[PDB]
C-alpha cells in the first residue's frame, strides 16, 4: 500500500550523474520529490526497485528507471517542453554520439580524479588529460551558444555538472579558453542550472 | 548505400548487422580486423571502433547510438515501443542486458583475461540466463510481443553460447523455444557473418 505514487528521484547531492538528472528536471519545470541518498547507506525502498542500488533512480507510479541516460531520455520524451533533443534522426544521433563522447572523454576522467580508489599516477594524469582536453575543445564554444548547438540540450546537461566541478577536480582553465569560460558564466547563471544545484554542490564553489 | 564497418566475429557488430537486417536496408558491409584499422574508418571515428555507420555527412558509432539511429531513420518495422514509459523500460532492459550478460560474455572472450575470471563469468552467465527462462513463456519476444532492439542485444549473445562454453539445462524450454524460432527468422539469418555461422 506504500508503493511509490508521485514522481521522485533518488539522488546523491554530491554526485555529477545525479546532478545531470536534477538539471533535466529543472529544465522541464516538473514537480518532483528529490530524495537525498548516502551512497554508503542505500535506503530500503531504493534497493527493492534497483538491484544495483545506483543513483540517480527515478520513480513514479509503476515506474523505476536508473542509469542517467535512460532517465534523461525518459524525461525528454515524457515532458516535451521545452525540447532538450533535436527531433530528426541525424541530428538526434549526433547529440547522442556527443553525449557518449562526453562520457568517455570527460566524465570518465573526472570519475577517475574523484574516486579514492585511484592511484596517485591515475588521478594526476587524468586531471592533466581533462584540463588539456577542455582547453582543446574551447574554440568550439565561439561557434554555438551552447555545446555544438545554439540550443539547450541533454548534451549540456551532461557537460555542465563536470564544468561546475573543475575547482573540486583541481583544474583551472587557461586564458586561451575564454570561449569555454564564457559558456560556463552564461550557463551557471541560467535559472534552471541554479535550481539544479544541491547545497553540497553550491558549496563546491565560492 | 549506407556503409557499416563491422567486425564479423564481434557480438557488438552483430547487434547492428541484425538491426540492419530487421529494417531490410541495403548496406555496404566492410569487414574490419581489430588488429588493422582501415584509414577511412580512422578518418571518421577517432576511437577506431566498430560497429561504425557511415552515410554522406553521417558517422555514428557506439552500438546503442547506432541502433537508435537505425530505429528512428528507418521506422518500419518498429523495434521500440512508441510511448515514453514502455520505451524507458526497453532502454533499461538493454542496459541490464549490457551489464549483467554482455559484460560477462566479454570477459569470457577477451584473450587478455585470466583463466579464473573466465571461469566465474561463464558460470554467472549460465545461471542468470537459466533463471530468466520462465519469462520467455509470457511473451513472444524478450519481455514484449514485438521484435525489439532488446532482442537485438540479446540474440548475438544467445547465438554465442557454444563458443562461450554454455549449455542451457533442459528446464530452460521457453528460452530454447525463443531461440529456435528467433534463429530461423529471415532477418536473423541475414545478419550472420561466415564466422558466426562457424560457431555452431
Q: Residue A1 is part of a domain; what is its CATH number? A: 3.40.30.10
Nearest to A70 among B57, B66, B95 (CB): B95
Q: How far is A189 from chain B (nearest CA, A)?
A: 31
Between the CA of residue B97 and those of A136, A149, A190, what are the distances in Å? 36, 32, 38
CB-hemisphere CA count at 13 Å for A25?
Answer: 25
Other Cβ atoms closer than 10 A to B98: 15
Q: Which residues is chain B interrupted after (C–N above 2.5 Å)?
A: none
Residue owning grid cell 518500419: B76
Nearest to A89 among B69, B84, B91 (CB): B69
Nearest to A100 among B62, B92, B99 (CB): B62
Residue B27, strand partner residues: B2
Chain A residue with the nearest C-alpha to that of B66: A93
CA quadruple A105, A13, A64, B102: dihedral sign: positive
Residues A126, A68 share a domain: no
Between the CA of residue B187 and those of A23, A47, A121, B61, B68, what are the distances in Å? 41, 39, 49, 22, 18
Residues A142, A73 share a domain: no
Say whether A2 sits in a helix, a strand or coil: coil
| Angstrom resolution of this structure | 1.9
Q: CB distance from A3 to chain B under 8 Å?
A: no
Q: CB distance from A100 to chain B under 8 Å?
A: yes
> Per the structure block, which three cell numbers stand in for A171?
583544474
| Angstrom distance (rounded) from CA B188 to CA B196 | 11
Task: Please return the burial class of B1, using the count of CB atoms within 10 Å of its CB with bins 0-12, 13-18 and 19+.
Answer: exposed
Name every chain B residue with its beta carbon within 8 A of the beta carbon of A70: 88, 91-92, 95
Closest CA to B14 of B147, B113, B198, B156: B156
Instruction: Answer for the pair A158, A20: CB distance below 8 angstroms, yes or no.
Output: yes
| Angstrom distance (rounded) from CA A93 to CA A99 | 10
Q: How far is A50 from chain B (nearest CA, A)?
A: 11
Instruction: Answer for the pair B164, B108: CB distance below 8 angstroms, yes or no.
Output: yes
Instruction: Answer for the pair A100, B65: CB distance below 8 angstroms, yes or no.
Output: yes
Give, for A35, the enclosing helix (H) or strand (E): strand A33-36
> Per the structure block, which three cell numbers stand in for A103?
562520457
Other Cβ atoms closer than 10 A to A43: 13
Residues B69, B151 share a domain: no
Residue B31, strand partner residues: B6
Instruction: Answer for the pair A202, A167: CB distance below 8 angstroms, yes or no.
Output: no
Method: X-ray
φ/ψ of A21, rounded to 5, equals -65, -40
Closest CA to B191 of B27, B54, B62, B50: B27
Q: CB distance from B85 to chain A under 8 Å?
A: yes
Residues A91, A178 share a domain: yes
Residues B123, B47 share a domain: no
Task: Please return the burial class of A160, using the count of CB atoms within 10 Å of its CB with bins 0-12, 13-18 and 19+.
Answer: buried
Instruction: Answer for the pair B84, A77: CB distance below 8 angstroms, yes or no.
Output: yes
Number of structural domains in chain A? 2
Residues B119, B171 share a domain: yes
Nearest to B69 among A71, A78, A93 (CB): A93
Q: Domain containing B41: what range?
A: 1-79+186-200
| Angstrom distance (rounded) from CA A132 to CA A150 | 24
Radius of gyration of chain A (CA): 17
Give, for A128, the enclosing helix (H) or strand (E): helix A120-137
Q: How far is B147 from chain A (nearest CA, A)?
A: 20
| Angstrom distance (rounded) from CA A92 to CA A184 | 24
Residues B132, B50 share a domain: no
Contact (CB<8Å) B91/A104 = no
| Angstrom distance (rounded) from CA A30 to CA A17 | 19
Residues B73, B4 share a domain: yes
Between the CA of residue A12 and those of A63, B21, B54, what are the distances in Å? 19, 42, 39
CATH code of the domain in which A170 resides: 1.20.1050.10
Contact (CB<8Å) B85/A70 = no
Contact (CB<8Å) A93/B72 = yes
DSSP-based helix, strand, coil % in chain A, nearest 5 = 55, 10, 35
Closest CA to B2 of B23, B195, B185: B23
Q: What is the dihedral of CA B106, B111, B114, B119, to 10 degrees?
A: 50
Residues B172, B116 share a domain: yes
| Angstrom distance (rounded) from CA B162 to CA B155 | 13
Q: CB distance from B155 to chain A under 8 Å?
A: no
Asked if omega into A56 is within 30° of 0 (cis), the reply is yes
Contact (CB<8Å) B60/A93 = yes
Between the CA of residue A16 and those of A170, A181, A188, what are the distances in Å? 16, 19, 15
Specify the DSSP class assigned to residue A176. Answer: G
> Pairing state of beta strands B52-55 and B2-6?
antiparallel
Q: Backbone dihedral region of A53: left (phi > 0), alpha (psi from -120 to 50 degrees) or beta?
A: left
> Per the structure block, which three cell numbers stand in for B101?
550478460
Closest CA to A20 of A127, A155, A180, A186: A155
Q: Backbone dihedral region of A43: left (phi > 0), alpha (psi from -120 to 50 degrees) or beta?
A: beta
- Opening angle at CA B143, ends B14 and B149, nearest 5: 30
Residues A31, A75 share a domain: yes
| Angstrom distance (rounded) from CA B135 to CA B96 | 15
Specify the DSSP class assigned to residue B3. Answer: E
Specify the DSSP class assigned to residue B77. Answer: S
Q: What is the dihedral of CA A86, B96, B143, A47, to 10 degrees?
A: -110
Distance separating the N- and C-terminal Cα atoms of chain A: 45
| Pick among B64, B92, B98 to test the A interface (most A CBs inside 10 A) | B92
Q: CB distance from A73 to chain B under 8 Å?
A: yes
Alpha helix ranges (H) inside A29-88: 44-47, 68-78
Residues A182, A92 share a domain: yes
Residues A63, A8 share a domain: yes
Alpha helix ranges (H) inside chain B: 11-23, 39-42, 63-73, 84-96, 103-109, 115-132, 149-159, 161-164, 173-184, 186-191, 194-197
CA quadruple A62, A23, B79, B77: dihedral sign: positive
> Per the structure block, which three cell numbers stand in for B160?
554465442
Amino acid at each position: 500500500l506504500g508503493a511509490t505514487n508521485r514522481l521522485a528521484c533518488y539522488s546523491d547531492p554530491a554526485d555529477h550523474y545525479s546532478h545531470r538528472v536534477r538539471l533535466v528536471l529543472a529544465e522541464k519545470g516538473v514537480s518532483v520529490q528529490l530524495i537525498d541518498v548516502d551512497p554508503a547507506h542505500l535506503p530500503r525502498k531504493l534497493a527493492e526497485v534497483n538491484p544495483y542500488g545506483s543513483v540517480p533512480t527515478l520513480v513514479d507510479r509503476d515506474l523505476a528507471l536508473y542509469e542517467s541516460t535512460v532517465v534523461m531520455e525518459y524525461l525528454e520524451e515524457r515532458y516535451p517542453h521545452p525540447p532538450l533533443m533535436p527531433v530528426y534522426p541525424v541530428a538526434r544521433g549526433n547529440s547522442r554520439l556527443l553525449m557518449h563522447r562526453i562520457q568517455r572523454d570527460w566524465c570518465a576522467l573526472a570519475d577517475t580524479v574523484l574516486d579514492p580508489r585511484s592511484s596517485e599516477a591515475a588521478r594526476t594524469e587524468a586531471r592533466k588529460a581533462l584540463r588539456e582536453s577542455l582547453t582543446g575543445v574551447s574554440p568550439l564554444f565561439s561557434e554555438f551558444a551552447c555545446f555544438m548547438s545554439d540550443e539547450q540540450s541533454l548534451v549540456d546537461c551532461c557537460l555542465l555538472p563536470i564544468l561546475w566541478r573543475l575547482p573540486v577536480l583541481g583544474i583551472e582553465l587557461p586564458r586561451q579558453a575564454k570561449p569555454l569560460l564564457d559558456y560556463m558564466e552564461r550557463q551557471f547563471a541560467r535559472e534552471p542550472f541554479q535550481a539544479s544545484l544541491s547545497s553540497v554542490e553550491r558549496e563546491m564553489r565560492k
